[PDB]
Amino acid sequence: MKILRTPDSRFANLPDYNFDPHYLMVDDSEDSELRVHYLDEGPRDADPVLLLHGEPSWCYLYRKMIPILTAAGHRVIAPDLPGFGRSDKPASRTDYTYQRHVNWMQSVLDQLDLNNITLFCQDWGGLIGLRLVAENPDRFARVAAGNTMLPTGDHDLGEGFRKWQQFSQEIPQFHVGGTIKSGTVTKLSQAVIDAYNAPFPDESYKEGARQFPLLVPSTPDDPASENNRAAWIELSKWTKPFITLFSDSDPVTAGGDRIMQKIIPGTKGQAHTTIANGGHFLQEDQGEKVAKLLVQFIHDNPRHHHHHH
Ligand SMILES: [Cl-]
Ligand SMILES: [Cl-]
Ligand code: NA
- C-alpha 122: how far from its chain's center? 5
CA distance 17 to 284: 13
Contact 51, 208 (CB under 8 A): no
DSSP reduced 3-state for 90: strand
What resolution (Å)?
1.0
CA distance 153 to 265: 23
**Would you tell me how many other CB atoms lie within 10 Å of the CB of residue 75?**
21
Could you give the CA distance from residue 291 to residue 191 in angstroms, rounded to a whole number?
23
Q: Is 123 in the active site?
A: yes
Asked how this structure was determined, the answer is X-ray
- 200-206: long-range contacts at Cβ-Cβ below 8 A with a sequence spacing of 24 or more? 200/6, 200/176, 201/6, 201/7, 201/10, 203/173, 203/174, 204/4, 204/91, 205/4, 205/6, 205/89, 206/56, 206/174, 206/176
Taking the C-alpha atoms of residue 261 and residue 3, their distance in angstroms, rounded to an integer, is 40
**Neighbour-count burial for 202-214, b at 16+ CB within 10 Å, e otherwise:** eeebbbbbbbbbe
Residues 6+ apart with CB under 8 A from 170: none
Q: Give the span between the Cα atoms of 268 and 271, in whole angstroms.
A: 9
Neighbours of 179 (CB within 10 A): 21
As a whole number of angstroms, the distance between CA 124 and CA 2 comes to 23
With contact defined as beta carbons under 8 Å apart, do 62 and 53 qualify?
Answer: yes
Q: How many residues in total does the chain contain?
A: 309
Alpha-carbon distances, residue 101 vs 56, 164, 212 (angstroms): 14, 21, 10
Query: Is residue 109 helix, strand or coil?
Result: helix
Phi-psi domain of 262 (left: phi exceeds 0; alpha: psi -120 through 50; beta: other): alpha
* Gaps after residue numbers in the chain (C–N over 2.5 angstroms): none
Q: Calculate how far, in angstroms, residue 219's C-alpha sits from the geometric centre of ligand 3.
A: 27
The active-site residue, picked from 37, 53, 101, 280, is 280
Q: Is 304 a residue of the active site?
A: no
CATH numeric code, 1-309:
3.40.50.1820
Using CA atoms, how far apart are residues 307 and 41, in angstroms rounded to an integer? Answer: 20
d(CA 172, CA 242): 40
In sequence order, the 6+-apart residues with CB closer than 8 A to the CB of 129 are 50, 52, 105, 119, 121, 143, 148
| Ordered alpha helix ranges (H), the chain | 66-71, 98-112, 124-135, 159-170, 176-182, 190-197, 207-215, 225-235, 256-263, 282-299
Task: Say how many Å lie between the first and final Cα of the chain, rounded.
Answer: 40
How far is the C-alpha of 290 from the C-alpha of 275, rounded, in Å? 8
SS3 (DSSP) at 192:
helix
HSE, CB side, 13 Å, CA atoms: give it for residue 93: 13
Determine contact, residues 279/309, Cβ cutoff 8 Å: no
Phi, psi of 244 (to 5 degrees): -105, 135
The CA distance from 166 to 171, in Å, is: 9
**Distance in angstroms (rounded) separating the CA atoms of residues 87 and 79:** 8
Q: How far is ligand 2, taken at its centre, from the CA of residue 299, in Å?
A: 32
Q: Which of 47, 80, 123, 222 is catalytic?
A: 123
Q: Which residues contact 178 (CB under 8 A, 6 or more apart)?
A: none
Q: Is the dihedral of CA 100, 217, 143, 234 positive or negative?
A: negative
Q: How far, in Å, is the centroid of ligand 1 from the Cα of 233?
A: 40
Please, which residues have CB within 8 angstroms of residue 260's CB and are 6 or more apart in sequence?
145, 235, 242, 244, 267
For residue 287, give the nearest of 150, 186, 151, 139 by alpha carbon.
Answer: 186
Ligand with the closest atom to the CA of 269: 3
Integer-rounded Cα Rg, in Å, for the chain is 18
Residues within 5 Å of ion ligand 2, judged at the Cβ atom: 55, 212-213
Q: How far is the CA of 145 from the centre of ligand 3 (A)?
A: 13
